[PDB]
């Protein structure tokens, strides 16, 4: 009513492409507890690395790591089919606990983090500086990851749909499509956003008839 225990910085986890996904925002009143559900990046994925982050940067790395833990015994499934519920819990004492629960297996793994963990009152204010100071640089970073993943999806889902079709697809088309996948898979390895969209364009155009069959 006169004071207010708050979070000076955003708390969350590294997600695919080295982006920080925030779970609990900046200047949040403790106690607080938010959850959010995630999944796997490669098919037949058996574990996920929860890597805990503090700070206002979009790149995972430009932020302060607080810890890191795996949840395994993920029963084999298609990618992005598991339900990994990551929960952040801060009590009256300032202590952050972070679980991940496989909603199938029913397994669980928590890390507890002392209120004294992560950046001191000075670094907090630098973090906020370097955030405002690199708003755009990270704006460019975010939309590239989004493109990397938007790309990375399109690749996987096409390779599926090509197996799914088989005989049904003109060899004519399956050549034009198999080349445009190879090119897009290379584009993904670089950092050139344009190029990724360029090969996603090429795929889109030569894939007209593949789409039809899947539908």
């Amino acid at each position: 009513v006169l004071l207010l225990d708050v979070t000076p910085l955003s708390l969350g986890i590294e997600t695919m492409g080295g982006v920080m996904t925030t779970l609990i925002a900046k200047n949040t009143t403790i106690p607080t507890k938010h959850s959010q559900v995630f999944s796997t990046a490669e098919d037949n994925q058996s574990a996920v690395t929860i890597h805990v982050l503090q700070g206002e940067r979009k790149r995972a790395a430009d932020n302060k790591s607080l810890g890191q833990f795996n949840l395994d015994g993920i029963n084999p499934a298609p990618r992005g089919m598991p339900q990994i519920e990551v929960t952040f819990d801060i009590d009256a004492d300032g202590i952050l606990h972070v679980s991940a629960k496989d909603k199938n297996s029913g397994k669980e793994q928590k890390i507890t983090i002392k209120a004294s963990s992560g950046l001191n009152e000075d670094e907090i204010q630098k973090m906020v500086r370097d955030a405002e100071a690199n708003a755009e640089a990270d704006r460019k970073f975010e939309e590239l990851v989004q493109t990397r993943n938007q790309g990375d999806h399109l690749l996987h889902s096409t390779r599926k749909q090509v197996e799914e079709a088989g005989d049904k697809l003109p060899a004519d088309d399956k050549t034009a499509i198999e080349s445009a996948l190879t090119a897009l898979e290379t584009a993904l390895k670089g950092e050139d956003k344009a190029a990724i969209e360029a090969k996603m364009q090429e795929l889109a155009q030569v894939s007209q008839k593949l789409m039809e069959i899947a539908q």
């Binding site: 986890i13 590294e14 997600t15 695919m16 996904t21 995630f38 999944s39 796997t40 990046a41 490669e42 994925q45 996920v48 690395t49 929860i50 990618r79 992005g80 990994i84 990551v86 993943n149």
Partner: peptide, 4 residues
């Protein structure tokens, strides 16, 4: 590796 985790995805949204």
């Amino acid at each position: 590796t985790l995805v949204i």
